């Protein structure tokens, strides 16, 4: 029986590979060679945040591009005012080793997570004024790698246990469990339509997940090492992955295969974060070389280099409205670019 | 400037004062990571230090300085992801079962892996070879010989510069020093000198155990300061 199942799985993998190669009529490069070049993008640091004490490990842009949340290993979440640089709220965390943070779309709640395996959603609109732990839900058997809000009551979170789950804030229990990853989940990004979400794990592969149905629709194995970063294309039809291989790859859900691989010989350090711009042409990816790089989604050429940070840039994100870019590094100094 | 903007700047200055106040407490406390396999007696060591939670923060004070010892024992075996964040810490407390020769090879392999880790290439490792009493009893009984597991032990002579404690049988001393030399060689190979291993022998009833961590952390911080001030 086991041998029959193994042979069936091998035949299915071969058939999937053949079907994927058949549709490989042309690469994105050949079609994007006729378009004008993006040129050099000389970005300058407009704001410098000097509040965080420890290594900045996470950040996210809410519905409003003025407020910015960022997490540090010291157990502090500071809602930074990008415009005026002021500090809106300071949230002393019970778990110092926080590795993720997200700003809810409604702008009322903010989540976090880390080695404690407990996701603490802090309400920023409490009638008492002070920040309070709304729901300290738990249940994961591993460190929380990423968390993102879907609505005012639903939040998806990734854990080191190699499985993702959707949590119900009001009920405080898992709404659905997502399994299939062989390695610890590390990255998670939500689609613009909120229908599907993609997540990466220590395994050299990615999977597309559905929020309404507890099952994965597609699986991408076009990677050489652990995929640490991932981000949904603004249109929700494609996504770029980041791995320690120091090479970014653009995957399209409609094509179901790699379109363009952004790689270079002089880039040997791994990748930790990836983000797309409003137009999608500027593919911003953070590298362990103590600086971020901007790649062209179409031409694949390096658009620019952000050498402002002196330490490993671990997190970065672009504003929703597309007005500025935030980059958080282990140097405890968050520099905004525009 | 508007009144609301001025009050926002005032609250920002208040939050900055709070952060600066917390910064002193943060930098004044020494963070320590406790690693070791399930066989290692790290739990016993933690219990002795009385001077699905993925994190177990243990705080103890010795000589008017606070120590923050973190024990990660409620997570998967894979550690190449979360071990990175534990960088920049004072020292890493690694515990190995020196009595169990079978798991000794796995412990050595884990120690080698942790030592050669990229992001931890600048953090020292405090190596506590626990269960020395069990190792001594075993090597005295003669039922289990290290030669069966390590052939080099047969051709290993006790270090001449060694300082055997009073009442130590030659076999016990030789075995413990062989294990210590194996660990020191594993740490030396590929070691750029940026971080040093602090091997120590710990027992089940030894009360003078936290002093070892105190001395190791003080030496590590002194060396880091010397490197910062360009004195070395």
């Amino acid at each position: 029986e086991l041998d029959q199942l193994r042979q069936e799985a091998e035949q299915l993998k071969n058939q999937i590979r053949d079907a994927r190669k058949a549709c490989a009529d042309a690469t994105l490069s050949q079609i994007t060679n006729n378009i004008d070049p993006v040129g050099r993008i000389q970005m300058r640091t407009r704001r410098t945040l000097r509040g965080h004490l420890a290594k900045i490990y996470a950040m996210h842009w809410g519905t409003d591009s003025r407020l910015l949340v960022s997490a540090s290993q010291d157990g502090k979440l500071i809602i930074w005012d990008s415009y005026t640089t002021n500090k809106v709220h300071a949230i002393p965390l019970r778990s110092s080793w926080v590795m993720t943070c997200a700003y809810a779309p409604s702008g009322n709640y903010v989540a976090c997570g880390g080695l404690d395996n407990i996701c603490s959603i802090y309400n920023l609109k409490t009638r008492e004024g002070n920040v309070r732990v709304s729901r300290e839900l738990a249940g994961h058997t591993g460190y929380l790698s990423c968390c993102r809000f879907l609505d005012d009551n639903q939040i998806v979170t990734s854990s080191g246990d190699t499985t993702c789950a959707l949590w119900d804030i009001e009920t405080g229990q898992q709404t659905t469990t997502f399994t299939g990853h062989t390695g610890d989940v590390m990255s998670l990004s939500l689609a613009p339509d909120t229908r599907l979400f993609v997540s990466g794990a220590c395994d050299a592969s990615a999977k597309l997940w559905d929020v309404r149905e507890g099952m994965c629709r597609q699986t991408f194995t076009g990677h050489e090492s652990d995929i640490n970063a991932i981000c949904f294309f603004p249109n929700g039809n494609a996504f770029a992955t980041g791995s320690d291989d120091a090479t970014c790859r653009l995957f399209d859900l409609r094509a179901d295969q790699e379109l363009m691989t952004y790689s270079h010989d002089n880039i040997i350090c791994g990748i930790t974060s990836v983000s797309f711009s409003k137009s999608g042409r500027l593919l911003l990816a953070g590298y362990d070389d103590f600086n971020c790089n901007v790649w062209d989604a179409l031409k694949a050429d390096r658009a620019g280099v952000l050498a402002g940070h002196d330490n490993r840039v671990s997190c970065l994100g672009v504003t929703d409205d597309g007005m500025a870019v935030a980059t958080g590094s282990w140097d405890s100094f968050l520099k905004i670019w525009n | 400037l508007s009144a609301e903007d001025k009050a926002a700047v005032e609250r920002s200055k208040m939050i900055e004062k709070q952060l600066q106040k917390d910064k002193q407490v943060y930098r004044r406390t020494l963070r320590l990571l406790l690693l070791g396999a399930d066989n290692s007696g790290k739990s016993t060591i933690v219990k002795q230090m009385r001077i699905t939670s993925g994190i177990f923060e243990t705080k103890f004070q010795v000589d008017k300085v606070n120590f923050h010892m973190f024990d990660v024992g409620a997570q998967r075996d894979e550690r190449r992801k979360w071990i990175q964040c534990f960088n920049d810490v004072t020292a890493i407390i690694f515990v190995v079962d020196s009595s169990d020769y079978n798991r000794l090879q796995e412990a050595l392999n884990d120690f080698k892996s942790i030592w050669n880790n990229r992001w931890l290439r600048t953090i020292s490792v405090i190596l506590f070879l626990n269960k020395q009493d069990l190792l001594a009893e075993k090597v005295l009984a003669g039922k289990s010989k290290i030669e069966d597991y390590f052939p080099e032990f047969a051709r290993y002579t006790t270090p001449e510069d060694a300082t055997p404690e009073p009442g130590e049988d030659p076999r016990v001393t030789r075995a413990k020093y062989f294990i210590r030399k194996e660990f020191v060689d594993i740490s030396t190979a590929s070691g750029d000198g940026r971080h040093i291993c602090y091997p120590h022998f710990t027992c089940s009833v030894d009360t003078e155990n936290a002093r070892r961590i105190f001395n190791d952390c003080k030496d590590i911080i002194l060396q880091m300061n010397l490197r910062e001030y360009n004195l070395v």
Partner: single-chain antibody
Framework: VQLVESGGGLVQPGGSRKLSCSAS????????MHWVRQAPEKGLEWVAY????????YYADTVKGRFTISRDDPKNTLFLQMTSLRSEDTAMYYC??????????????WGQGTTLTVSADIVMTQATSSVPVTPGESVSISCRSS???????????LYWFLQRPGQSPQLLIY??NLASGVPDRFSGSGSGTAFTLTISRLEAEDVGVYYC?????????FGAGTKLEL
């Protein structure tokens, strides 16, 4: 959240009295406190202000020097020392909390108030002092300011307050933005100097005195008040 003021009573001219307000149900340390008086059968008027941590303290020209504000965060209490009380100072003082940050709602909670029976600033002028209207009808209130409240940051520092008969003022609009707990029937719009408050469908409990306030400069001036009679 609840603010309870105390210390009111009869005081002769030239005397001294200290009002006290006990804060509870919120982080008093993070909220800046305001003092607003209301003379009998008259509008509102700002008295003094103290910021978080006692860093910034202000007083109105009508009371500067005589009144001194102080707070004790460890006990969550506010104090307003009054000296040389004048016959004109007879009024009911309301303690108000305020927290300043992007998206905040200053002046969101007004205390129960305490009565004291003794013995340039931007001016705000409302369309009318009284407006009789029937229930269910759409009511529109308007006011004008002598200086443009639209600051360079695009924020219109206008506030609207509703003081129902026998109750303390309640915040309705703190900038078009609707305060928490206020029904959607209330809406605010206006230019840099012309402002309008609209009630899409007036309720029986919506009757009362509507007070405006400018916050472009700390010398706060409250409107003359517009009554809505059922």
């Amino acid at each position: 959240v609840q603010l309870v003021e105390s210390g009111g009573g009869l005081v002769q001219p030239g005397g001294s009295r200290k009002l006290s307000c006990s804060a509870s149900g919120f982080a008093f340390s993070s909220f800046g406190m305001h003092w607003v008086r209301q003379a009998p059968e008259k509008g509102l008027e700002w008295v003094a202000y103290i910021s978080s941590g006692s860093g910034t303290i202000y007083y109105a020209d009508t009371v500067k020097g005589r009144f001194t504000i102080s707070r004790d965060d460890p006990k969550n209490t506010l104090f307003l020392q009054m000296t040389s009380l004048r016959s004109e100072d007879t009024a009911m003082y309301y303690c108000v909390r305020s927290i300043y940050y992007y998206g905040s709602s200053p002046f969101d909670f007004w205390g129960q108030g305490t009565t004291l029976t003794v013995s340039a600033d931007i001016v705000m002028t409302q369309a009318t002092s009284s407006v009789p209207v029937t229930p269910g009808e759409s009511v529109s209130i308007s006011c004008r300011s002598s200086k443009s409240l639209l600051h360079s940051n695009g924020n219109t520092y206008l506030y609207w307050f509703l003081q129902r008969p026998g109750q303390s003022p309640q915040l309705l609009i703190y900038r078009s933005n609707l305060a928490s707990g206020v029904p959607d029937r209330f809406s605010g719009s206006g230019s840099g100097t012309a402002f309008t408050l609209t009630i899409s469908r007036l309720e029986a409990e919506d009757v009362g005195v509507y007070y405006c306030m400018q916050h472009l400069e700390y010398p706060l001036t409250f409107g003359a008040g517009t009554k809505l009679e059922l």
